[PDB]
Ligand binder design. Structure first.
Ligand SMILES: [Cl-]
Ligand SMILES: [Cl-]
Ligand SMILES: [Mg+2]
Ligand SMILES: [Mg+2]
Ligand SMILES: [Mg+2]
Ligand SMILES: [Mg+2]
Ligand SMILES: [Mg+2]
Ligand SMILES: [Mg+2]
Lengths: 236, 8, 236, 8
């Protein structure tokens, strides 16, 4: 696309600048360009891709939730009719969010996942796939909602199976996957008990492996463990 | 509160 | 443009939704559409226009300053050569910022200012004109920089002359104009003494008129007075 | 510090 004429290394360099500038839409466009060069991504480059799109979609999700809350108050008893505008604007934001999710899913399908053989890369991309189907599920209503939820579940489950076989229980990628799959269970799949069990099991298995870690790896792992604990505290 | 997912 | 088919009232309604959603680019696009209907703007509508573009340009200014700081470190002794990318990306952000400023200035010229007869509206728009030329001056280097600075100055001065004749010294529009013109003097025009004198005089004349005000107007005026004091504290 | 201009 518009990045086709820019060097791969320059796209990555500019993604890093955009991050520093808090220009996340630019960051995401640079990283899309880098992916579309066709080469596999390094660990650092995967992280840049993730950060860029997570920030873009996160802003959209936050706006969607504000608009949805105004829309659902408009649809209460005793609410004055104010016309189509709230729905139309919610729809506009929703369609943009869906477009971003579709963009990310398209990068994963063409061709990041199929070229990813190492557990670090494959788990990362499958977790991403689950996340972006999860964001689609948050706004889905209507006939494909079940299928979207199933797509998220399937991606997460494939990532889980690989991570349990190939990574230690403290690996930050494995931990973040488990965190996000637990969120899926609680918030999307109407399975709070599964969410709680996964978070508990994950936390406890990681605890038991901390003794193997350097000081720096310990800090990395315990940061995510704390998030599992924060959700457990919220959910119980 | 909404649940916390993995941060950047 | 893209808003030509939307009702004026719907554009305003959606600008308010976009503000709630922190969707300032959308907000600005809705308000541009509303302006381009050709009718004069109410006080509330002027404020929406201002808020939208101030937030858009403010994000651009912040990003520009981050990029400029990285660029000027690259141009120090002992800095490794890293290629054209920093300059190119700074230029990209700068060009976008300039485009937003040009958009606002174009709305003012076609035809908000010429239709504005009341002091509240005219002062507001002339202050806006000064502000957006000021933002252009922040990034200007090269042959028109003087002319851009002079355009800012001229707009501010016309606004000042009207405000002193037609508004009380506590009027929040008058106060904000004086605040921003003082910033122009200090940061753009290399005139710190003029900045300090304007802020002092403005503050003191407002103080002397507070006794005339209701509790609510008092709160409005004193909020801006405090900003004048904060700058005086910084500059002395 | 940069100088403060009028807020929203
Ligand atoms: Cl809309
Ligand atoms: Cl660029
Ligand atoms: Mg090449
Ligand atoms: Mg829809
Ligand atoms: Mg139970
Ligand atoms: Mg009409
Ligand atoms: Mg330039
Ligand atoms: Mg002196």
């Amino acid at each position: 696309g518009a990045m086709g004429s820019m060097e791969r290394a320059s796209l990555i360099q500019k993604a890093k600048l955009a991050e520093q500038a808090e220009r996340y839409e630019d960051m995401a466009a640079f990283m899309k360009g880098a992916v579309e060069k066709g080469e596999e991504l390094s660990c650092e480059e995967r992280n840049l891709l993730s950060v860029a799109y997570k920030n873009v979609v996160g802003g959209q999700r936050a706006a969607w939730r504000v608009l949805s809350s105004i829309e659902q108050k408009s649809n209460e008893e005793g609410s004055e009719e104010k016309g189509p505008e709230v729905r139309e604007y919610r729809e506009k934001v929703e369609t943009e969010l869906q477009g971003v999710c579709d963009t990310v899913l398209g990068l994963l399908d063409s061709h990041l996942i199929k070229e990813a053989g190492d557990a670090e890369s494959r788990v990362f991309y499958l977790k991403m796939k689950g996340d972006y189907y999860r964001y689609l599920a948050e706004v889905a209503t209507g006939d494909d909602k079940k299928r979207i939820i199933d797509s998220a579940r399937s991606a997460y489950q494939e990532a889980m199976d690989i991570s349990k076989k190939e990574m230690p229980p403290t690996n930050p990628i494995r931990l973040g996957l488990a965190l996000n799959f637990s969120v899926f269970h609680y918030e999307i799949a109407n399975s709070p008990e599964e969410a709680i069990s996964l978070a508990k099991t994950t936390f406890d298995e990681a605890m038991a492996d901390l003794h193997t870690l350097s000081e720096d790896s310990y800090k990395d792992s315990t940061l995510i463990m704390q998030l599992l604990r924060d959700n457990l505290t919220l959910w119980t | 509160q909404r649940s916390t997912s993995t941060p950047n």
